[PDB]
Amino acid sequence: SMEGILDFSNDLDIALLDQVVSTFYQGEGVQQKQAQEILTKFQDNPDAWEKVDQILQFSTNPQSKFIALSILDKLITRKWKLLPNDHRIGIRNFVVGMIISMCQDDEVFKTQKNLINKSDLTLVQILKQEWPQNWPEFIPELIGSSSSSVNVCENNMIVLKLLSEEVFDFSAEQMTQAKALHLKNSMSKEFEQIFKLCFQVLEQGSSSSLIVATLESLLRYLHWIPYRYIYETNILELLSTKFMTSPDTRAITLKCLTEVSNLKIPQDNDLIKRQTVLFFQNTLQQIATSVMPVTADLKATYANANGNDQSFLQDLAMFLTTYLARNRALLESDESLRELLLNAHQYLIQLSKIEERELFKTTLDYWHNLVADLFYEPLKKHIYEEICSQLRLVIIENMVRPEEIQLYKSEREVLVYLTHLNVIDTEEIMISKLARQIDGSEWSWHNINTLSWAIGSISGTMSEDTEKRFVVTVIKDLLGLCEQKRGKDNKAVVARDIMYVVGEYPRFLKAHWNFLRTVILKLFEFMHETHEGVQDMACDTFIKIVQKCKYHFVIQQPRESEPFIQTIIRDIQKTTADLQPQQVHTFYKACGIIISEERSVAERNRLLSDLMQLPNMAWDTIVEQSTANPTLLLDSETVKIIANIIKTNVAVCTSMGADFYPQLGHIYYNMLQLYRAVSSMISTQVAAEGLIATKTPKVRGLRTIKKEILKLVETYISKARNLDDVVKVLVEPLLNAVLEDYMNNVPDARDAEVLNCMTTVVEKVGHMIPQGVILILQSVFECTLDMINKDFTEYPEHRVEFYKLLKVINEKSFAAFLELPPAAFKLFVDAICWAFKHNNRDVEVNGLQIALDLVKNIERMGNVPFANEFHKNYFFIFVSETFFVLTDSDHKSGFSKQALLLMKLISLVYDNKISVPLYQEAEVPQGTSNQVYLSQYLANMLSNAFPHLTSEQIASFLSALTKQCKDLVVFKGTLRDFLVQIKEVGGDPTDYLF
Amino acid sequence: VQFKLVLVGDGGTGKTTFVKRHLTGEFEKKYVATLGVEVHPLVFHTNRGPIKFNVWDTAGLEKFGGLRDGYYIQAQCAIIMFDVTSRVTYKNVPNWHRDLVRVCENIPIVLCGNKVDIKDRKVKAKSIVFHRKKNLQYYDISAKSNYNFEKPFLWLARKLIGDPNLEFVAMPAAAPPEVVMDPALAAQYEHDLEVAQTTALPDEDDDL
Amino acid sequence: FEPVVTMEEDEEVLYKVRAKLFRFDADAKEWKERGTGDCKFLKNKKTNKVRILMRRDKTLKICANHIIAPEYTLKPNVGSDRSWVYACTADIAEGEAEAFTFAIRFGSKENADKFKEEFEKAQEINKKA
Numbered sequence A: 001s002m003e004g005i006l007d008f009s010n011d012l013d014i015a016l017l018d019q020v021v022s023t024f025y026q027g028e029g030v031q032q033k034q035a036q037e038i039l040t041k042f043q044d045n046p047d048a049w050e051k052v053d054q055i056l057q058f059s060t061n062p063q064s065k066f067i068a069l070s071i072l073d074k075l076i077t078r079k080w081k082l083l084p085n086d087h088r089i090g091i092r093n094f095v096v097g098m099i100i101s102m103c104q105d106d107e108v109f110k111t112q113k114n115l116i117n118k119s120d121l122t123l124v125q126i127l128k129q130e131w132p133q134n135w136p137e138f139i140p141e142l143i144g145s146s147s148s149s150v151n152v153c154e155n156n157m158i159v160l161k162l163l164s165e166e167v168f169d170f171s172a173e174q175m176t177q178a179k180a181l182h183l184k185n186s187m188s189k190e191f192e193q194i195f196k197l198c199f200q201v202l203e204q205g206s207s208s209s210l211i212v213a214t215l216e217s218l219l220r221y222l223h224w225i226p227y228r229y230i231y232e233t234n235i236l237e238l239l240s241t242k243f244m245t246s247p248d249t250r251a252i253t254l255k256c257l258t259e260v261s262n263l264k265i266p267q268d269n270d271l272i273k274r275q276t277v278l279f280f281q282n283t284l285q286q287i288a289t290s291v292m293p294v295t296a297d298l299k300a301t302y303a304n305a306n307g308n309d310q311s312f313l314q315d316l317a318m319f320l321t322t323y324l325a326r327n328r329a330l331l332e333s334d335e336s337l338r339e340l341l342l343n344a345h346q347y348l349i350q351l352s353k354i355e356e357r358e359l360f361k362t363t364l365d366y367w368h369n370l371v372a373d374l375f376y377e378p379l380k381k382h383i384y385e386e387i388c389s390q391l392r393l394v395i396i397e398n399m400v401r402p403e404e405i406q407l408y409k410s411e412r413e414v415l416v417y418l419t420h421l422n423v424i425d426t427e428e429i430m431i432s433k434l435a436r437q438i439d440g441s442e443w444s445w446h447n448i449n450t451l452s453w454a455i456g457s458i459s460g461t462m463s464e465d466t467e468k469r470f471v472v473t474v475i476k477d478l479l480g481l482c483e484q485k486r487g488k489d490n491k492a493v494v495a496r497d498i499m500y501v502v503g504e505y506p507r508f509l510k511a512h513w514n515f516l517r518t519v520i521l522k523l524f525e526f527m528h529e530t531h532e533g534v535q536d537m538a539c540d541t542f543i544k545i546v547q548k549c550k551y552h553f554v555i556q557q558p559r560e561s562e563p564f565i566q567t568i569i570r571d572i573q574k575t576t577a578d579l580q581p582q583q584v585h586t587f588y589k590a591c592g593i594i595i596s597e598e599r600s601v602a603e604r605n606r607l608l609s610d611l612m613q614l615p616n617m618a619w620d621t622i623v624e625q626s627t628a629n630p631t632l633l634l635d636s637e638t639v640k641i642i643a644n645i646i647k648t649n650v651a652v653c654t655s656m657g658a659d660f661y662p663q664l665g666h667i668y669y670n671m672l673q674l675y676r677a678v679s680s681m682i683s684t685q686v687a688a689e690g691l692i693a694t695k696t697p698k699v700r701g702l703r704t705i706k707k708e709i710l711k712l713v714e715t716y717i718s719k720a721r722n723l724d725d726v727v728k729v730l731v732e733p734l735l736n737a738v739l740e741d742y743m744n745n746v747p748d749a750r751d752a753e754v755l756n757c758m759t760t761v762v763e764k765v766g767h768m769i770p771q772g773v774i775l776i777l778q779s780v781f782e783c784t785l786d787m788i789n790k791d792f793t794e795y796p797e798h799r800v801e802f803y804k805l806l807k808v809i810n811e812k813s814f815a816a817f818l819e820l821p822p823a824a825f826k827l828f829v830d831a832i833c834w835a836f837k838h839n840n841r842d843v844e845v846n847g848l849q850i851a852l853d854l855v856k857n858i859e860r861m862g863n864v865p866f867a868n869e870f871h872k873n874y875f876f877i878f879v880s881e882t883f884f885v886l887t888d889s890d891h892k893s894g895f896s897k898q899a900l901l902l903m904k905l906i907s908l909v910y911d912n913k914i915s916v917p918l919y920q921e922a923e924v925p926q927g928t929s930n931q932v933y934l935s936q937y938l939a940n941m942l943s944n945a946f947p948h949l950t951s952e953q954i955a956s957f958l959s960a961l962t963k964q965c966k967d968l969v970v971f972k973g974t975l976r977d978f979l980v981q982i983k984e985v986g987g988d989p990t991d992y993l994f
Numbered sequence B: 001v002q003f004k005l006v007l008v009g010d011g012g013t014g015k016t017t018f019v020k021r022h023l024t025g026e027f028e029k030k031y032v033a034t035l036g037v038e039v040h041p042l043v044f045h046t047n048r049g050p051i052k053f054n055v056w057d058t059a060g061l062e063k064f065g066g067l068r069d070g071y072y073i074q075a076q077c078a079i080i081m082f083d084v085t086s087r088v089t090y091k092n093v094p095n096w097h098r099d100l101v102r103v104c105e106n107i108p109i110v111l112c113g114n115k116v117d118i119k120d121r122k123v124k125a126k127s128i129v130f131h132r133k134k135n136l137q138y139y140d141i142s143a144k145s146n147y148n149f150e151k152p153f154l155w156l157a158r159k160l161i162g163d164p165n166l167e168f169v170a171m172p173a174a175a176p177p178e179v180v181m182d183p184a185l186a187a188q189y190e191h192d193l194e195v196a197q198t199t200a201l202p203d204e205d206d207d208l
Numbered sequence C: 001f002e003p004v005v006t007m008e009e010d011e012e013v014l015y016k017v018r019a020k021l022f023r024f025d026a027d028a029k030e031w032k033e034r035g036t037g038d039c040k041f042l043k044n045k046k047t048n049k050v051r052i053l054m055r056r057d058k059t060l061k062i063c064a065n066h067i068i069a070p071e072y073t074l075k076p077n078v079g080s081d082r083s084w085v086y087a088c089t090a091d092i093a094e095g096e097a098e099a100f101t102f103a104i105r106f107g108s109k110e111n112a113d114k115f116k117e118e119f120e121k122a123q124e125i126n127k128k129a
């Protein structure tokens, strides 16, 4: 019978609603679910707001009344202005009356905070509609009613807090510009009186709850009020003394003082500066005497997490960092402020030792500010020497792995600055921490790793000589540690750290060839170590060292018989014999980096030939045996070898780019033959076994071959220098191998990488291959569109690659779209709008970009039939589709480019850049301007789409929009105002004059 | 020992996916928008005994919002979710936080940036500062890779039980029952296994 | 001077391997993950019965707990060369014993082949016991 509340035709049973509500909130499983659905339907019923008065009076259940207020809030925020004035006053009084009543009952006031707070928010929703134009007495009455009762006074502080939030903090997206300015001005005009009440409560208040509520409102005011209310009253003194002493007010007060520190303030005023110093002195004095002294172990306190200590200490870090970032130059000038300055910083040091990642980042942002400044500001660093010395230890002990990119970067930067400020101190700290690893007192994997990360981070900060002595010392010490340790778990940790450190010091490696050679030879030995992570670190260290020291591998070093790259290549089979494929590919990639350093072409090509000897020999034998016996590709093992050959080519092409061409030339024609051979087998297997075949290991292996072939070609063409060879040698065989294969496979067998490969081709050489581009379109366009035009989810990669391809074709080879038959060009426009309706940004952004580029492409053509035909056929489709995605609330991430496109389309008309009439004859007077017709069309369209708008709203909007169609940020403002007004009834049309 | 947990955040951020993974271990790849709320109990075993979260997984899409802040009543903790691959999800975090704390004034809250597994991250680490002044915990998470995926609950549990040493522990493993093959359900087994053997496992390119 | 004031302890680990475990949902006719973590074959030192015990990473929650019945057969999946599917008649990971079609996937074929070898060894142990 719970569904009785949904009847509405009969009177509402309140005991039944309290049943349903109770079942929802307290109930379980099946029962909770049914009540849920009923409640949701009840709430969404458009006439349910009428039942609110009844629920609020006669319900016992506070949850029922909460939901009642939700229903009223819906009415107030969407449909309020449809109500007669009398009814709006009646509702307003009922709400106010209910709040006062609840506040005057101490039992209810104490126990029903949620319902009171909800009521207060409902009141504020009414104020946003009604105040002050229809409620000039609101504030005087509120201020008046505050003196009557302490509960009412406290609650009035909650109402004012919410109002300030709604007007100043959350208005930007919820209100028109004009309405937000109206409410801001209104609050500003009456603030003197509000402040007077707030100041009085704080100056002469005993209720902590009332004082805390008042301070909560003040925090919100501090966002917008002028500084004089803080600096030219006694309030600063109250905040920084009295309210810091009691712990009930301390939390909110510290937050207020953080915002005080952010006030816009006169910069050239000695009294203000003294006041700024003084509140900080007072605050820190209260902390040192009432909370904890400067020496306190905050790490311990925070970890213990008693009461509100964690939040307090977070707030204290925020206060100190905020204040000092703005005001520490004030404290630096006078020597009577030196203790205060250093004590504040010592508190920050203590805070930075807290084991809480997000707190640490907060303090680290501040330290970065400080040490950056000491690095450049004259006559400052000496003040902070003891702070900085402590900070060096804190950062070193908290260094994270370079994988944590942003935190590692922040920490490194701080440590680099600190190292510059005192290299000896940094060096001593690191050497002594290293000794505590060696003596075992601080030994652990975590501890040796963190230390190694720290040591690596300061590479390049020391003089070459100092660094030389430091690195030798570190390496000797780590080597000794590696000896000490028993079992390869321990030895592998230290060896990886040695590898890490050496790879971070390329300047040292470049000055010490023997050492560098030895390191490389050691990495080669480690490429045989199967202990977990060792081969990976050896390969990663190898490529890292190569990236940084490549020149040293390509020259013949003193007392060597050849460039070391020759020696690496000579032994490559032995070096790589125990590696996994991915590791081998890294190794070959690293060799590729070295070989690209060789600028003699004959020598470079010879090295490339030599490097690719094993893949090329395996390839040759497979190509010969494979083509002579096409069965061999059925072998699982052969497919794997072929894939790894191709991946090796990709790896080397990745680092060699343009220089890879001779190797590409060696394999290219047989690789495209292989692509075709592999394609046939997949098609064959799918027919023989079904679509399930595409999931099988064998077909997946075959498809990997095709994708790696496409990746190789993409990689080379993306980096090619000789584009004539690309066009004349590479492109035609490529298109022949891949396009028909793509078109003639079933959707599930088509590789999206074909689209990506073609994107690269068009990007690079599309200007030179107009006929090739047409072939690309003809092969992929309709069959891919048909894969992706049934929903937004199927074939996600094809969807993304498809719009990237259309995007580059539209940019590089627009003539290819001019060649389309009208019907296919219509599908192109349909495809572009389809992308607009996508929620995935990867597709939506490309769709909007293609439309703007297309408009631009049509504009370029000038006054010719195709351009005039395009506008007659498509101008209004683009305008209406853009408006759809703008206004449907499902495409908000696209707002900016939607607005740009709409602005472009409107500006075309209001510049008279469209020669022909957009209207068909027998629609308007023959002489009618496109301007007038556009206004008419949009007004009619918006009237139909949004029938709750007045004609005046629509006309004002459109008038504004067309005047602002050369000022994007203002245009966007008008669009946002419209998006607000369509969510409610009775929006003011003068808003569009903002 | 049970606690109401409210999960809020923009549509598509991974709220339901995250909870479902915690409930059953499955990773739902499809986006099926939550209608109003789904409530599910979630138990963790701790060194201080079991802790139960009454998880109110709310809808992030405005059109499916249902009771909205009505769901937040008497929540003892919350997670606010966004998607590090969608900036608007982060831009809306202050909005969710506002609605939430107005109803739940003094509760522990974790802010979670989901989808850190996706390489092309759009909400950068350095942009994420909202939590600081609001005293929220923050974690980078991935419901897909399981990166940090227990951390929100471990943190909340520590806050709610008021013990910073509280650990999740291995739930005891009862010895399982010996099996008897019912010959009447012999042909049935072959049919179901046939179907299972010929339906491909998902994500065959993943490490596991 | 007075001084200042799992239920696997009965079991030997025969084999341990990282795995992803799936259960087949016939309703949706799709495979669903049940957990990723260490799969262990545990031999109870009292009964000499070998079970699979698998726990999810991070939560350490059980996603498999069942006897390695001599009657079970590991079968290939069509999509994978590093997975087995088998019917399980009584798994108590989520409390009450229930039948499942499981699929377990490993990091490599070698791991899968090794798992099958160990699974069969354990079946043989569960026959003698």
Ligand SMILES: C/C=C/[C@@H]1O[C@H]([C@H](N)/C=C/C=C(\C)C[C@@H](C)/C=C(C)\C=C\[C@H](O)C[C@H](N)CC(=O)OC)C[C@@H](O)[C@@H]1C
Pocket (backbone or CB within 6 Å): A471, A472, A475, A476, A479, A482, A483, A488, A491, A492, A495, A496, A498, A499, A512, A515, A518, A519, A522, A529, A531, A534
């Ligand atoms: C300018 C030059 C000045 C001087 O070079 C001296 C020497 N010529 C350099 C030797 C370098 C090496 C042996 C390479 C070494 C630094 C790198 C590593 C990764 C060593 C690792 C361990 O020895 C191997 C480990 N045990 C194996 C294991 O079990 O792991 C699984 C050294 C020291 O006095 C100075 C720097």
Ligand SMILES: Nc1nc2c(ncn2[C@@H]2O[C@H](COP(=O)(O)OP(=O)(O)OP(=O)(O)O)[C@@H](O)[C@H]2O)c(=O)[nH]1
Pocket (backbone or CB within 6 Å): B009, B010, B011, B012, B013, B014, B015, B016, B017, B018, B027, B028, B029, B030, B031, B032, B033, B034, B035, B058, B059, B060, B061, B114, B115, B116, B117, B118, B141, B142, B143, B144, B145
């Ligand atoms: N890459 C990636 N995708 C994820 C992750 N978590 C969830 N997803 C996917 O992103 C989408 C999220 O869907 P849901 O979890 O239903 O989103 P939601 O926040 O519950 O949505 P609403 O119920 O509408 O508020 C699904 O397609 C998920 O599979 C993650 O960590 N990484």
Ligand SMILES: [Cl-]
Pocket (backbone or CB within 6 Å): A510, A549, A551, A552
């Ligand atoms: Cl050099």
Ligand SMILES: [Mg+2]
Pocket (backbone or CB within 6 Å): B015, B016, B017, B032, B033, B034, B057, B058, B059
């Ligand atoms: Mg959901």
